[PDB]
Coordinates of C-alpha atoms in Angstrom, one line a residue:
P85 CA -28.7 -45.3 -3.9
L86 CA -27.3 -42.6 -1.4
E87 CA -30.9 -41.3 -0.8
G88 CA -32.7 -40.0 2.7
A89 CA -30.4 -36.8 2.6
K90 CA -33.1 -33.9 2.8
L91 CA -33.7 -30.6 3.7
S92 CA -36.6 -28.7 5.2
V93 CA -37.1 -25.1 5.1
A94 CA -39.3 -22.7 7.3
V95 CA -40.0 -19.4 5.3
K96 CA -41.3 -15.7 5.9
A97 CA -42.2 -13.0 3.4
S98 CA -40.1 -10.0 4.3
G99 CA -42.0 -6.9 5.1
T100 CA -40.3 -3.8 5.9
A101 CA -36.6 -3.2 6.4
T102 CA -36.6 -2.4 10.2
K103 CA -38.0 -4.9 12.2
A104 CA -39.8 -2.4 14.4
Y105 CA -43.3 -1.4 15.1
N106 CA -44.7 1.1 12.5
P107 CA -48.5 1.5 11.3
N108 CA -47.1 3.7 8.3
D109 CA -45.3 0.9 6.5
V110 CA -48.3 -1.4 6.9
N111 CA -49.5 -1.0 3.1
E112 CA -50.0 -4.7 1.9
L113 CA -53.1 -5.6 -0.3
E114 CA -55.1 -9.0 0.2
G115 CA -53.0 -11.6 -1.7
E116 CA -49.7 -9.8 -1.8
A117 CA -48.1 -12.0 0.6
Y118 CA -50.2 -15.5 -0.8
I119 CA -47.8 -18.4 -1.5
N120 CA -49.0 -20.3 -4.2
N121 CA -45.8 -22.4 -4.1
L122 CA -42.4 -22.8 -2.8
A123 CA -39.3 -23.6 -4.6
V124 CA -35.5 -24.8 -3.3
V125 CA -32.6 -25.3 -5.3
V126 CA -29.3 -26.8 -3.8
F127 CA -25.7 -26.4 -5.3
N128 CA -22.5 -27.5 -4.3
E129 CA -20.3 -25.0 -2.6
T130 CA -19.0 -23.2 -5.8
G131 CA -22.5 -23.6 -8.1
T132 CA -21.0 -26.2 -10.5
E133 CA -23.4 -29.0 -9.4
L134 CA -26.9 -29.5 -8.6
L135 CA -27.4 -31.5 -5.3
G136 CA -31.5 -31.3 -5.6
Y137 CA -34.4 -28.9 -5.9
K138 CA -37.9 -29.2 -5.1
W139 CA -41.2 -27.0 -6.1
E140 CA -44.2 -27.5 -4.3
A141 CA -47.7 -25.9 -4.7
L142 CA -49.4 -24.9 -1.3
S143 CA -53.1 -24.3 -0.7
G144 CA -53.9 -21.3 1.8
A145 CA -50.4 -20.2 3.0
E146 CA -49.7 -16.5 3.3
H147 CA -46.6 -14.8 4.9
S148 CA -44.7 -17.8 6.3
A149 CA -44.8 -21.5 5.0
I150 CA -43.0 -24.8 4.8
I151 CA -41.5 -26.8 2.2
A152 CA -40.1 -30.2 3.5
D153 CA -38.1 -32.9 2.6
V154 CA -36.2 -31.1 -0.4
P155 CA -33.7 -33.8 -1.6
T156 CA -29.8 -33.0 -1.2
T157 CA -27.8 -36.1 -2.6
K158 CA -24.5 -35.3 -1.0
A159 CA -23.4 -34.6 3.0
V160 CA -21.7 -31.2 1.6
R161 CA -21.4 -27.5 1.8
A162 CA -24.1 -26.3 -0.2
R163 CA -25.3 -22.9 -2.0
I164 CA -29.1 -22.8 -1.5
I165 CA -31.8 -20.5 -3.0
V166 CA -35.5 -20.7 -1.8
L167 CA -38.1 -18.8 -4.0
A168 CA -41.9 -18.6 -3.8
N169 CA -44.7 -17.8 -6.9
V170 CA -42.5 -19.0 -9.4
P171 CA -43.0 -21.7 -12.5
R172 CA -43.4 -25.4 -11.7
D173 CA -40.9 -26.3 -14.2
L174 CA -38.4 -23.6 -13.7
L175 CA -35.9 -25.6 -11.5
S176 CA -36.3 -28.9 -13.7
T177 CA -34.1 -27.1 -16.4
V178 CA -31.6 -26.1 -13.8
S179 CA -27.3 -27.1 -14.5
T180 CA -25.1 -24.5 -12.8
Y181 CA -25.5 -21.6 -10.5
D182 CA -24.3 -19.1 -13.0
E183 CA -26.8 -20.4 -15.5
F184 CA -29.6 -20.1 -13.0
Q185 CA -28.4 -16.5 -12.1
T186 CA -29.2 -15.6 -15.7
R187 CA -33.4 -16.5 -15.7
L188 CA -35.6 -13.8 -15.8
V189 CA -39.1 -13.2 -14.4
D190 CA -41.5 -11.4 -16.5
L191 CA -43.9 -8.5 -15.0
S192 CA -46.8 -10.4 -16.7
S193 CA -46.7 -13.2 -14.1
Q194 CA -47.1 -10.6 -11.2
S195 CA -50.2 -9.7 -9.8
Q196 CA -52.0 -8.9 -6.4
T197 CA -52.7 -12.7 -5.6
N198 CA -48.9 -13.7 -7.3
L199 CA -45.8 -11.9 -6.4
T200 CA -42.5 -13.8 -6.6
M201 CA -40.1 -13.3 -4.0
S202 CA -36.7 -14.9 -3.2
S203 CA -34.0 -15.3 -0.5
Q204 CA -30.6 -14.3 -0.5
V205 CA -28.0 -16.7 -1.5
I206 CA -27.4 -18.8 1.4
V207 CA -23.8 -20.3 1.5
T208 CA -23.3 -23.2 4.2
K209 CA -20.2 -23.0 6.4
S210 CA -21.0 -26.3 7.8
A211 CA -21.6 -29.4 5.4
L212 CA -25.2 -30.6 5.1
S213 CA -25.4 -34.1 6.9
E214 CA -26.6 -37.7 5.3
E215 CA -30.0 -37.2 7.1
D216 CA -32.4 -34.5 7.8
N217 CA -31.3 -30.9 7.5
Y218 CA -33.1 -27.9 8.5
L219 CA -33.4 -24.3 8.0
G220 CA -35.5 -21.5 9.7
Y221 CA -37.1 -23.7 12.1
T222 CA -37.3 -21.7 15.5
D223 CA -38.0 -24.4 17.8
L224 CA -35.0 -26.7 16.6
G225 CA -32.6 -23.7 17.4
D226 CA -28.9 -24.7 16.8
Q227 CA -30.1 -27.9 15.1
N228 CA -30.7 -25.8 12.1
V229 CA -27.8 -25.7 9.3
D230 CA -25.2 -22.9 10.8
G231 CA -27.8 -22.3 13.6
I232 CA -30.2 -20.2 10.9
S233 CA -33.1 -20.8 13.4
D234 CA -35.1 -17.6 12.4
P235 CA -37.5 -18.3 9.0
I236 CA -35.5 -17.6 5.8
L237 CA -36.8 -14.2 4.6
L238 CA -38.3 -14.2 0.9
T239 CA -38.0 -10.6 -0.5
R240 CA -40.3 -9.7 -3.7
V241 CA -38.6 -8.8 -7.0
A242 CA -41.8 -6.3 -7.9
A243 CA -42.4 -2.9 -6.7
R244 CA -46.0 -0.9 -6.3
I245 CA -46.6 2.4 -7.7
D246 CA -49.7 4.0 -6.2
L247 CA -51.4 7.4 -7.4
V248 CA -52.9 8.5 -4.2
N249 CA -53.5 12.0 -5.1
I250 CA -53.9 14.6 -7.9
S251 CA -54.9 18.1 -7.2
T252 CA -54.3 21.8 -8.8
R253 CA -52.6 25.1 -7.7
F254 CA -54.5 27.5 -9.6
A255 CA -55.5 30.2 -7.1
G256 CA -53.7 33.6 -7.8
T257 CA -52.6 32.1 -11.1
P258 CA -54.1 33.4 -14.4
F259 CA -55.6 29.7 -14.6
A260 CA -57.8 30.2 -11.1
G261 CA -61.1 28.5 -11.4
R262 CA -60.5 26.4 -13.8
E263 CA -60.6 22.6 -14.0
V264 CA -58.4 19.7 -15.4
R265 CA -59.7 16.5 -16.6
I266 CA -57.6 13.4 -16.2
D267 CA -57.4 11.5 -19.5
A268 CA -55.3 8.6 -18.6
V269 CA -52.7 7.4 -16.4
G270 CA -49.5 5.1 -17.2
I271 CA -46.0 4.4 -16.1
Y272 CA -43.2 5.4 -18.6
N273 CA -39.7 3.5 -18.5
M274 CA -40.7 0.6 -16.7
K275 CA -38.6 -2.5 -16.4
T276 CA -40.8 -5.5 -17.2
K277 CA -38.0 -7.8 -16.6
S278 CA -35.9 -9.1 -13.3
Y279 CA -33.5 -11.6 -12.0
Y280 CA -35.7 -14.4 -9.9
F281 CA -32.8 -13.8 -7.2
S282 CA -29.8 -11.5 -6.0
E283 CA -26.9 -12.9 -4.0
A284 CA -27.3 -10.5 -0.9
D285 CA -30.4 -10.1 1.0
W286 CA -32.6 -7.5 -0.6
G287 CA -29.9 -7.1 -3.1
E288 CA -30.1 -6.0 -6.8
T289 CA -32.7 -7.9 -9.1
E290 CA -32.8 -5.4 -11.7
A291 CA -32.4 -6.8 -15.2
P292 CA -30.7 -5.0 -18.2
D293 CA -33.5 -5.6 -20.5
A294 CA -34.9 -2.3 -22.3
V295 CA -37.7 -0.3 -20.3
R296 CA -41.2 -0.3 -21.7
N297 CA -44.2 2.0 -21.3
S298 CA -47.5 0.7 -19.7
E299 CA -50.7 0.6 -21.3
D300 CA -52.9 3.5 -20.1
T301 CA -55.5 3.5 -17.7
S302 CA -58.3 5.7 -19.0
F303 CA -60.9 7.6 -16.8
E304 CA -64.6 8.7 -17.8
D305 CA -65.3 11.3 -15.1
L306 CA -62.1 12.3 -13.2
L307 CA -61.9 16.0 -12.6
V308 CA -59.6 17.8 -10.6
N309 CA -59.8 21.5 -8.9
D310 CA -58.0 23.4 -6.0
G311 CA -59.2 21.2 -3.1
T312 CA -59.4 17.9 -4.6
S313 CA -58.5 14.8 -2.4
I314 CA -58.9 11.5 -3.9
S315 CA -59.4 8.8 -1.3
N316 CA -59.8 6.0 -4.0
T317 CA -56.0 5.9 -5.3
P318 CA -57.3 5.5 -8.9
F319 CA -54.1 4.0 -10.3
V320 CA -51.7 1.1 -9.1
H321 CA -49.0 -0.9 -10.9
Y322 CA -46.5 -3.2 -10.1
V323 CA -43.1 -2.7 -11.5
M324 CA -39.5 -4.4 -11.8
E325 CA -36.6 -2.8 -9.8
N326 CA -35.0 0.1 -11.8
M327 CA -32.4 2.1 -10.0
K328 CA -29.2 1.5 -12.4
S329 CA -30.7 2.4 -16.3
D330 CA -30.3 5.9 -17.2
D331 CA -34.2 5.4 -18.4
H332 CA -35.7 6.1 -15.0
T333 CA -39.3 4.8 -14.2
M334 CA -41.9 7.6 -14.4
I335 CA -45.6 8.5 -13.8
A336 CA -47.5 9.5 -17.0
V337 CA -50.4 11.7 -16.9
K338 CA -52.4 12.9 -20.3
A339 CA -54.4 15.7 -18.8
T340 CA -56.9 18.5 -20.4
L341 CA -57.4 22.0 -19.0
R342 CA -60.9 22.8 -19.4
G343 CA -62.2 25.9 -21.5
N344 CA -64.0 28.8 -20.6
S345 CA -65.1 30.5 -23.7
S346 CA -62.0 32.7 -23.8
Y347 CA -59.4 30.0 -23.8
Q348 CA -59.4 26.6 -25.8
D349 CA -58.9 23.4 -24.0
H350 CA -55.2 22.6 -23.7
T351 CA -53.8 18.7 -23.4
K352 CA -50.7 17.5 -22.7
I353 CA -48.8 14.3 -21.6
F354 CA -47.0 15.2 -18.1
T355 CA -44.3 12.9 -16.7
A356 CA -42.1 12.8 -13.8
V357 CA -39.4 10.5 -12.6
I358 CA -40.6 8.8 -9.3
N359 CA -38.5 9.0 -6.3
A360 CA -35.9 11.2 -7.9
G361 CA -34.8 12.7 -4.4
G362 CA -35.2 9.7 -2.1
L363 CA -31.8 9.6 -0.7
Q364 CA -32.2 13.4 0.2
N365 CA -35.8 12.7 1.9
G366 CA -34.4 10.5 4.3
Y367 CA -34.9 7.1 2.5
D368 CA -32.3 4.3 1.6
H369 CA -32.3 4.9 -2.3
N370 CA -33.3 6.7 -5.3
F371 CA -35.7 5.7 -8.1
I372 CA -37.5 2.3 -7.8
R373 CA -36.1 -0.7 -5.1
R374 CA -37.7 -4.2 -5.1
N375 CA -40.4 -4.8 -2.2
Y376 CA -41.0 -1.0 -1.9
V377 CA -44.3 0.9 -2.3
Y378 CA -44.4 4.4 -4.0
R379 CA -47.4 6.9 -3.2
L380 CA -47.5 9.6 -5.6
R381 CA -49.1 12.9 -5.1
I382 CA -49.4 15.2 -8.3
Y383 CA -49.9 18.8 -8.6
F384 CA -50.8 21.2 -11.5
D385 CA -50.0 24.8 -11.5
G386 CA -49.6 28.4 -13.5
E387 CA -46.8 26.5 -15.2
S388 CA -48.8 23.3 -16.5
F389 CA -50.5 25.0 -18.9
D390 CA -50.8 27.8 -21.4
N391 CA -53.9 30.2 -22.4
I392 CA -54.7 29.4 -25.7
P393 CA -56.9 31.9 -27.2
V394 CA -60.2 30.7 -28.9
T395 CA -59.9 30.3 -32.8
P396 CA -62.8 31.7 -35.2
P397 CA -53.3 17.5 -32.6
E398 CA -50.4 15.3 -31.3
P399 CA -50.0 16.1 -27.1
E400 CA -46.7 17.9 -26.6
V401 CA -44.8 15.8 -23.6
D402 CA -44.0 18.1 -20.5
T403 CA -41.2 16.0 -18.6
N404 CA -41.3 18.9 -15.3
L405 CA -44.6 17.6 -13.8
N406 CA -44.6 18.5 -10.0
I407 CA -44.9 15.5 -7.9
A408 CA -44.3 14.1 -4.3
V409 CA -43.2 10.9 -3.7
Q410 CA -43.5 8.8 -0.4
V411 CA -41.4 5.9 0.0
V412 CA -43.2 3.2 2.4
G413 CA -42.5 -0.2 3.6
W414 CA -44.5 -3.2 2.2
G415 CA -45.2 -4.8 5.5
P416 CA -48.7 -6.6 6.8
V417 CA -51.0 -6.2 9.7
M418 CA -49.8 -7.6 13.1
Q419 CA -49.6 -11.5 13.1
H420 CA -50.3 -14.3 15.8

């Protein structure tokens, strides 16, 4: 019947919050901007009716891409959502906007070469036409729906935690000259579920689903002392947004202070809330936000372990681990 009413969308992966030159906010690993597929869902103004959808796999798309000729049954005002790296069949089961808002993306689908992104909820001011509609086409300018000529920004639902360094502060303490062995590193209180999108651009995607602890990443020969600078960043983990929950995302470190014939080995599990002082440090938020990278520096000191005398099992948890968190942008290197 009334066919030929279509929508074409030009997209771009959001890098940093500020559209400015900053080398420190360049933290994107290869693959993290891959656009394996694009999906567009179009609802009527109230989200009561589905006007159309399209999912499409892409080859060699990264940072920016196009999804052309999305069908839109009617020439009416619409509610549009654009997503990248989502399941092929997600949109085929869509009915209403309110039901689509309930859909959850699991952290198990997230990897360095596949990160789910989405746009804000675009509510058109003008009705769409019975012909070809466009969004994000810079060269078309005002011919775009509501003159939205800049590519639709797609923001990651995931966040990345990086353990950049572990060191000790034992000089002038009773633990001076002793080494600590890093047994394992993991994430405590991580959100493994997320909404696919938010109504606002870079809005809240945090899902109410109960937090979970990650599997521990073991280390064979990871020894630390006073002056240890780790250039490899031994632990990198994707997590979902976590800012509203009482169970704040934490770094977990099982560490052992080595013996010396006078004192026994001392093993504990050390935990610390990531970005507890973000707002005080000049960042736009505390805790974990979507599309942000968290650079963690860990320190052991004179208050970290006890001097247990040598004798002629379950490790205790110390929530008072001293850590420094640098919140950085998730931007790429300069493009063409």
